[model samples]
Target chain A: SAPVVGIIMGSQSDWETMRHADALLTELEIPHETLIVCAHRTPDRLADYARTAAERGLNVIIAGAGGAAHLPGMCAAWTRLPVLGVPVESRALKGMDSLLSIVQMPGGVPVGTLAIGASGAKNAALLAASILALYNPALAARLETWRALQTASVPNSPIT
Target chain B: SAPVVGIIMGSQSDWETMRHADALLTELEIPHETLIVCAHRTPDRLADYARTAAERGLNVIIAGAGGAAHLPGMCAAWTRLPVLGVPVESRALKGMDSLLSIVQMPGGVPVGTLAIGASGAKNAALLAASILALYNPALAARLETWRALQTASVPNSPIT
Candidate 1:
């Protein structure tokens, strides 16, 4: 089956966070593919991936990176397909640096960015599914079901 | 008098958030200067400012930027002076990109990062002051006063 989402990260280490996106997409049964594509070290690969994303059967692209994270914005720069950025938590300053680099695109280009670490990755998957759901009735119903279950799982009050 | 703290940002637009750092620094009576230094557009200016920062008698540096924010990291690269980063809220993805770009640094170079937007800006000043406080007893006392007031400002519970 053709993948609807393309999940890419700067390094293998990012898989620790990017995996959350993979997990949620899997749970929702959204066909997706993940890859390690460094923006700095692999500029050619990034350019190729972004330029060909839409034609490659991908509806959404999620690019995660840490420390001078340029994957998301650069991807957005090269493609018209909607891109989501996840800032992988880095060792020194956490993911703050990653978040800034990914989220801050100029006026012309845009990359929908999520939170830092696991939460961002998880939400990226859900956001992608939601986008897909607009035109996918079956996926829409599944999304609603998953969301309702998520809502139900939360406790009403804060735990000590 | 020599400014002890140097607050720099990528553009005039960043003043909206960086102003918080400026205001806080003023409140603490810390002599400081603010300037515009763009990393991509004005690479020469960035290099010059970072290189001359310590020689100018600046004790701390707070660099803020939005969208591919390389200002803080670049500044850190040039000088060993303690650099604090504030991720300004950008138009598209808020300040997530700024946060990550500023926070995540390689092992050798470091930039202590704060929250996104104004809170982060405010904290950057305090963090800079904290760094200065290690040697200046008078400023240390003022910093304590400000912190105590901040502590008192918080409420016990969320309000309606």
Candidate 2:
């Protein structure tokens, strides 16, 4: 089956954070694929993957990277599909570097970036499913149910 | 009279977020200067500014930009002076893009990144002052006082 969502990261190590997106997508029953595509190490691959992402039947792309993460923006540059960026925590500055490099794009190209680390990874999948749901009624209904469940999960007051 | 801190941003519009850094730096009595420097539009200016920053007696640099914030990273790339990045909130994705672009540097270079928007801006100034305080005994005392006042200002009990 063709993937509706493409989840890509800069390195294999990023799986720790990007896995959150995969897990959430799996739970949502969204068809998606994951890949390790480093911007610096494999610029050629990024160029080919992003430029051809839509034609390959992908609706949205979620890219995560840490430390000078140029993957998401670079992907957005090549593809018209809405892109989401997740800033994975790095060794020195945590995920701050990853967050800045991905979100701060010049005008014209836009990448809807999420929060840093796992929270961002999770949101990327949800956002992707939300976007795709605009055309898929079944997915939309499921998304609504998921949202309601999430809202109901919140407690009335803090125990502490 | 040499300014110890140099705070620059991508554009005049960024003053909204960068101003928090300015105000905090002013409150801390740290001599600093602010400017509008666009990395994409005016690369020459950035090249000249970063190369000359240290020679001009500037001890630290704080750069802020909203989208694809290369100011801090580029500044760090050019000079040995410690660079602090502030991720200004953008219209599209808030400051998540800004935060990632600024903080993620390749191993050889480094740009210390702060939080997003105003909080990041405020903390950039504080971090700059802290860096300067390492050499200035007077500034060290003032920073300690400032931190103490900040700590004291937090309420012990929740009103809401």
Per-residue lDDT tens digits for candidate 1, residues B1-160, read 5798999998999998899999999999999999998999999999999999899998899999987889999999999899998888777776667877888899999999987777789989989999899999998999888877654443321121
lDDT of 2 by residue, A84-144 (tens): 9998887887777887888899999998999788878999999998998999999999999
Worst 10 residues of 2 chain A by lDDT: A151-160
Q: After superposition, how far is residue A140 of candidate 1 from its true place, in Å?
A: 0.4
Task: Estimate TM-scores for all models.
Answer: 0.52, 0.52
**By summed lDDT, which 10 consecutive residues of candidate 2 chain B come out lowest?**
B90-99
CA deviation > 4 Å runs, candidate 2: A1-160
